[PDB]
Amino acid sequence: QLNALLASLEAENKQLKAKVEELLAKVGE
Amino acid sequence: QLNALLASLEAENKQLKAKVEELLAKVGE
Known part of the structure; x- marks a missing residue:
């Protein structure tokens, strides 16, 4: 389950970076 | 080193959530 936590955190981080x-x-508008 | 990666990802996620x-x-301004 540690890899699943890593995977979830990675996915969240990617999403948050895109939202930023x-x-x-x-x-900028 | 897996816990250190988890820790770094957690820290980044918290920072990104605050930046969002x-x-x-x-x-909203």
């Missing part, structure tokens, strides 16, 4: 990119771009 | 909160609030 989206919101950054929105702030 | 900040940028959300900025979008």
Whole structure:
């Protein structure tokens, strides 16, 4: 189950980084 | 080293969630 936790955290991190990119771009409007 | 990777990912996730909160609030301006 440790690899599943790693996988979930990795997925969340990727999603959050993309959300930051989206919101950054929105702030630039 | 697996716990260190978990720890780093957890720290990053917490930081990113807070950055999302900040940028959300900025979008609301």
